[PDB]
Write a protein that binds this DNA or RNA. Structure first.
Ligand SMILES: [Cl-]
Ligand SMILES: [Cl-]
Ligand SMILES: [Cl-]
Ligand SMILES: [Cl-]
Ligand SMILES: [Cl-]
Ligand SMILES: [Mg+2]
Ligand SMILES: [Mg+2]
Ligand SMILES: [Mg+2]
Ligand SMILES: [Mg+2]
Ligand SMILES: [Mg+2]
Ligand SMILES: [Mg+2]
Ligand SMILES: [Mg+2]
Ligand SMILES: [Mg+2]
Ligand SMILES: [Mg+2]
Ligand SMILES: [Mg+2]
Ligand SMILES: [Mg+2]
Ligand SMILES: [Mg+2]
Ligand SMILES: [Mg+2]
Ligand SMILES: [Mg+2]
Ligand SMILES: [Mg+2]
Ligand SMILES: [Mg+2]
Ligand SMILES: [Mg+2]
Ligand SMILES: [Mg+2]
Ligand SMILES: [Mg+2]
Ligand SMILES: [Mg+2]
Ligand SMILES: [Mg+2]
Ligand SMILES: [Mg+2]
Ligand SMILES: [Mg+2]
Ligand SMILES: [Mg+2]
Ligand SMILES: [Mg+2]
Ligand SMILES: [Mg+2]
Ligand SMILES: [Mg+2]
Ligand SMILES: [Mg+2]
Ligand SMILES: [Mg+2]
Ligand SMILES: [Mg+2]
Ligand SMILES: [Mg+2]
Ligand SMILES: [Mg+2]
Ligand SMILES: [Mg+2]
Ligand SMILES: [Zn+2]
Ligand SMILES: [Zn+2]
Lengths: 85, 244, 91, 77, 103
RNA sequence: AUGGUGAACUAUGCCUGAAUAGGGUGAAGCCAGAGGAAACUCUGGUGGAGGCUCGUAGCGGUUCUGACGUGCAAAUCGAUC
RNA sequence: UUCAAAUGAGAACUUUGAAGACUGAAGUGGGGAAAGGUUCCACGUCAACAGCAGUUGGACGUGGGUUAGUCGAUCCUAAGAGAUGGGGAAGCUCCGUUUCAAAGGCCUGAUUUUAUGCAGGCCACCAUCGAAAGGGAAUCCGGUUAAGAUUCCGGAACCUGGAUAUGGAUUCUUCACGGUAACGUAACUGAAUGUGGAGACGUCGGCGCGAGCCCUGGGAGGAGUUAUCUUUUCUUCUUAACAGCUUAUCACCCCGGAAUUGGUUUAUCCGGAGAUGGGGUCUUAUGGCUGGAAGAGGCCAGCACCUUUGCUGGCUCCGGUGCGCUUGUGACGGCCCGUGAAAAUCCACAGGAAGGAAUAGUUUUCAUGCCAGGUCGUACUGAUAACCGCAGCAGGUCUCCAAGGUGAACAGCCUCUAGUUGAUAGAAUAAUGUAGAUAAGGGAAGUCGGCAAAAUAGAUCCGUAACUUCGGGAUAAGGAUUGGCUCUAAGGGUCGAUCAACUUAGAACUGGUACGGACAAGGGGAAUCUGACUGUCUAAUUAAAACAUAGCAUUGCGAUGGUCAGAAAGUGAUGUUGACGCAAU
């Protein structure tokens, strides 16, 4: 339990403590699935709330699939700029 | 010496055909009153794969003329035949792909398949995928029909023999390289025990007429006469010529 | 991006079997794995099952065809020959 | 194995001509948001099934006991 | 960390030797042998599953009422509604077409 | 030479079952973006193919020509593979 | 391995207690298939056997022990085996399995002399054997013995076969009503014959969901530690078959009519052959609540006492988390010149032969009630001692369950549960060995030969040639970094607030410059001979350049046939086959 608390604070995680590859520790597909589900969940929420019409929703749906946005914050800012123009 | 490999196959112990997954024998309808006078209509219910056979098979259901029930037949499917299609078989059937007609009821140049050698044997000729028989003429006297066979030979067949209009489906199969020993393994796994094959010159004299010697060589002409006996017929049997 | 220059689908075989043999398999692998128009429902939903069997995802129609293509060149010629001969029997 | 919720149906089971035994169980349990109350279960032993009637009202429970047929063998706790 | 054992003499992991781990009122983990799952009845024409029909092992159908094994319609429990609709329309139109061919 | 007995080992086919961590590589198909008059050409992702690859259980048995060599053993033991 | 006690004539070896250790969940743990056959358990006992010992034992002597309508066998069929009818053979016998055969019996009507003679029709499938892992009607929990249990006891269920009554339902419109529909229900006639479904099925990949396990918060008990510290460490808090209600991705129905194309998966598929959207229907894998059921089981406290040994009290509650582990399952996707059993058995539908109501009948597919369920197997070992190897032999022998930490990991290393502590011992430390190791300077000078050994090794970042079938070569080659500690930034869910995961990057500080600190873990390069590759063989001296392989070519054959088998045959293999085939090189 004491060791787990140290790990939660960021300790024992340097290059000298890693034996598997980055993929073995955390698969890149798992990271992608988390991010795309985050982006798609936000787009449906905005469209249902009426903040975005279906025409702009469809454009942003295929941009997120095309790796246009690196995180949720980048998508929200892009929506604001699109609505500001 | 001992009994050679090609002699052991006739005993039929481990060299029998692997027929567990076969859909059934592919035959035409039994030649009956409806076929030889008029026609009878069937329906293609499904087109299915057959293990050990390149060409697909079609299941066609006909009504029993003399009993209230349905009779199912297994046909070798031709190109263009689809599920739900009506198939017409008999002397008075139309000239369409999939129909079964006597050879004397079609004009010259008609392409047919699953042709009967004799009327009623339910199909013997042009059964493999992509093969067909070409009708080249008729002889109304003596009721004979002249056709061309896939091997190129010319045969005289009775005009009452039946055949299916079209060409056997699945053609072009042998144009694709097998590319590996594994695919050859799975091919003959559904057919029979004949693969792989060990060369005779790699054996000992007790095993094969080509065996032995301080080098691998046949040592005598590989052209064997038609009159040789079992244990001698290894190589090129009754060869008229050799070379490229 | 473009991942391979010329091997295409035959990149799964690596460097084995020879280039000429891999080239021949490439032509027939693309044909057998493609989607074809259904002559019954008009959609592009026909794919091969076993060799010589072609089924449409819609409308549940199965058509007997070639080993790696829906229709071979020989089968097309046979249809024209039968159609020409049929027209000379009724009229 | 089977639970009944209608009291009128319960009395019909007690005189079904195949029922010979019954038991009464008292449970001291708590209600949704108050102090514990008294729960009683009336169990009728049929030929193939056991019927259980549960009533959470003590006042209504005592009346049911007095209404049971005398010929029925009743087991307490 | 309790470990379980088979409750029959079959020691192999076959389709008829499936088990599920359950916890008993005695507070221990014990293997529970489960039967193979049932398959829904299929339509006679299109082959899709039939709506409103119970999913049971073949022998268990004899132990349930007729309500669980049919639908209140022609060919109920044998053909689906859309396939029955096709049969009725096809039967009517063809029979009408036969009359106009007769005259 | 005559008449008999063996496929519980093993060889091969068939029928019906069961078994096989974690990694590397990243083929088709698909999405977005960039360049160009056009044909089309590049970039980033996605995807997870192979009688591919590192390496456990498993299967096999290269070397030390190691141990043993009236042995634990009429073929085994250890390391390496 | 050690100390002590007990027993005994006698104790390194038996029993008990204490201590030190190991197996470390792919076990030295807990069950089985085959094989063995009483080795199982108790009492008595030590001549022989346990290559020392023996008071002990799988030894010796005498007894005890295996309980089933629900678990298997029994039934079904698989590859295959094999009677009959017939044909061969001097003959023992051979062929063949639906075959050149007059190959057989259940629905009844007819009869109240008696039991079935006798009228139609139906059906022609035409022995039998073949699976303790395939198919398959039906059971669970708690308790109980020296040794038995899903088999005994208590409680609670279910199936099949057979008897029958009541209630309910239905009928004077004789064989039910509702919903536009998908369809719903406590029921709600149906012979021959026909059709359909279930039985019934490959493999790999990721994703969703369920169960058990793992981790964890609060609280109610018990135990450990306490010089000091620790609201702390460990442990208990459980819910079966079955039953009622309810619960679903997929699929389907109704309304409506779409380009400013929309919807939508991690994975690109769907829509005028009707999308999105709104409202509905259904499968019940699965979960929830309740009955079963707290009366059980579990954890504690207070009382009796040689004793048959109990008696009385409490508590057994409420949450969180996930690329976790194992396993089940759903919707999908990849692959084949490979497309991945059969039968018994059960149900539904189409059909309409018959039987039926008014002072009366039918439904045992609705509910309740009554009776029966035979035969054989069942103990135990399952292996460094119960099997096979001449044996209590380091060999061989099919399979299920699988905790914590480290770490990519079922690797190695340590620990909990459980199980063992068994292998003749004591003393000494010569040579020579077997096994494990280290060496100054030189660095293959050794040797047939770098044989053996050493060096390299994880991860992150940088960098990477000739050649090439353009796929590779490649971890090419060649470099740098890695601890601890204190911080910072970014990446989410539900509804401004609130809650919850280890992933990556960076910066100071710190040390005998150490940090994949044990464990774990590639030497590399330039060329020649040879086989293309993966694969295969001389069980027990040869693993290769040998065999095989894809590719290429040649030969025979159109069935009254090619190749091959047989003593013969009304006999066979290829052949459930037909030249894109079979056969021979
Ligand atoms: Cl041979
Ligand atoms: Cl198998
Ligand atoms: Cl070895
Ligand atoms: Cl020495
Ligand atoms: Cl070569
Ligand atoms: Mg990814
Ligand atoms: Mg990826
Ligand atoms: Mg040789
Ligand atoms: Mg010779
Ligand atoms: Mg010769
Ligand atoms: Mg079984
Ligand atoms: Mg054998
Ligand atoms: Mg062979
Ligand atoms: Mg390898
Ligand atoms: Mg040696
Ligand atoms: Mg010696
Ligand atoms: Mg160890
Ligand atoms: Mg240990
Ligand atoms: Mg004993
Ligand atoms: Mg002795
Ligand atoms: Mg002695
Ligand atoms: Mg016989
Ligand atoms: Mg049998
Ligand atoms: Mg026992
Ligand atoms: Mg037992
Ligand atoms: Mg023996
Ligand atoms: Mg022996
Ligand atoms: Mg030195
Ligand atoms: Mg030195
Ligand atoms: Mg030298
Ligand atoms: Mg020298
Ligand atoms: Mg070496
Ligand atoms: Mg080689
Ligand atoms: Mg490999
Ligand atoms: Mg050898
Ligand atoms: Mg060797
Ligand atoms: Mg060779
Ligand atoms: Mg045969
Ligand atoms: Zn279509
Ligand atoms: Zn349907």
């Amino acid at each position: 339990r004491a060791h787990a608390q140290s790990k939660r604070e960021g300790r024992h995680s340097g290059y000298g403590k890693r034996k598997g590859t980055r993929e073995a520790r955390l698969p890149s597909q798992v990271v992608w699935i988390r991010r795309l589900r985050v982006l798609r969940r936000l787009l449906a929420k905005y469209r249902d709330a009426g903040k975005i019409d279906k025409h702009l929703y469809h454009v942003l749906y295929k941009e997120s699939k095309g790796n246009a946005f690196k995180h949720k914050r980048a998508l929200v800012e892009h929506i604001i700029q699109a609505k500001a123009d | 010496g001992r009994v050679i490999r090609n002699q052991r196959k006739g005993a039929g112990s481990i060299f029998t055909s692997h027929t567990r997954l076969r859909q059934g024998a592919a035959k035409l309808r039994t030649l009956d009153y409806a076929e030889r006078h008029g026609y009878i209509r069937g329906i293609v219910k499904q087109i299915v794969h057959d293990s050990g056979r390149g060409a697909p098979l079609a299941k066609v259901v006909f009504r029993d003329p003399y009993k209230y029930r349905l009779r199912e037949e297994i046909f070798i499917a031709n190109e263009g035949v689809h599920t739900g299609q009506f198939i017409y078989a008999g002397k008075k059937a139309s000239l369409n792909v999939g129909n079964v007609l006597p050879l004397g009821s079609v004009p010259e140049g008609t392409i047919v398949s699953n042709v009967e050698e004799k009327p009623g044997d339910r199909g013997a000729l042009a059964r493999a995928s992509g093969n067909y028989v070409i009708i080249i003429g008729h002889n109304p006297d003596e009721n004979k029909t002249r056709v061309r066979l896939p091997s190129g030979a010319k045969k005289v067949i009775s005009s009452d023999a039946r055949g299916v209009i079209g060409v056997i489906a699945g053609g072009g199969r042998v144009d694709k390289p097998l590319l590996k020993a594994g695919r050859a393994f799975h091919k003959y796994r559904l057919k029979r025990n004949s693969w792989p094959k060990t060369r005779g010159v790699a054996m000992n004299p007790v095993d094969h007429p080509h065996g032995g010697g301080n080098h691998q060589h046949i040592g005598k002409a590989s052209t064997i006469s038609r009159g040789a006996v079992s244990g001698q017929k290894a190589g090129l049997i009754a060869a008229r010529r050799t070379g490229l | 991006a473009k991942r391979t220059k010329k091997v295409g689908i035959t990149g799964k075989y690596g460097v084995r079997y020879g280039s000429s043999l891999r080239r021949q398999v490439k032509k027939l692998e693309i044909q057998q794995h493609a989607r074809y128009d259904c002559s019954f429902c008009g959609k592009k939903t026909v794919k091969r099952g076993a060799a010589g069997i072609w089924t449409c995802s819609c409308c549940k129609k199965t058509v007997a065809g070639g080993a790696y293509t829906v229709s071979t060149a020989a089968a097309a010629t046979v249809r024209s020959t039968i159609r020409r001969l049929r027209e000379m029997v009724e009229a | 194995a089977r639970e009944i919720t209608d009291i009128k149906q319960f009395l019909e089971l007690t005189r079904r001509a195949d029922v010979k035994t019954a038991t009464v169980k008292i449970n001291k349990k708590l209600n949704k948001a108050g102090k514990p109350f008294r729960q009683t279960k009336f169990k009728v032993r049929g030929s193939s099934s056991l019927y259980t009637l549960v009533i959470n009202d003590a006042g209504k429970a005592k009346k049911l006991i007095q209404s049971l047929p005398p010929t029925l063998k009743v087991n307490r706790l | 960390a309790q470990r379980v054992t088979f409750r029959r003499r079959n020691p192999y992991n076959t389709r008829s030797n499936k088990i599920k781990v359950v916890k008993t009122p005695g507070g221990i983990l014990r293997a529970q042998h489960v039967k193979k799952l049932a398959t829904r009845p299929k339509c006679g024409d299109c082959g899709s599953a039939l709506q409103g029909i119970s999913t049971l092992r073949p022998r268990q159908y004899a132990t349930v009422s007729k309500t669980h094994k049919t639908v209140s319609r022609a060919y109920g429990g044998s053909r689906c509604a859309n396939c029955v609709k096709e049969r009725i329309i096809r039967a009517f139109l063809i029979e009408e077409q036969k009359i106009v061919k007769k005259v």
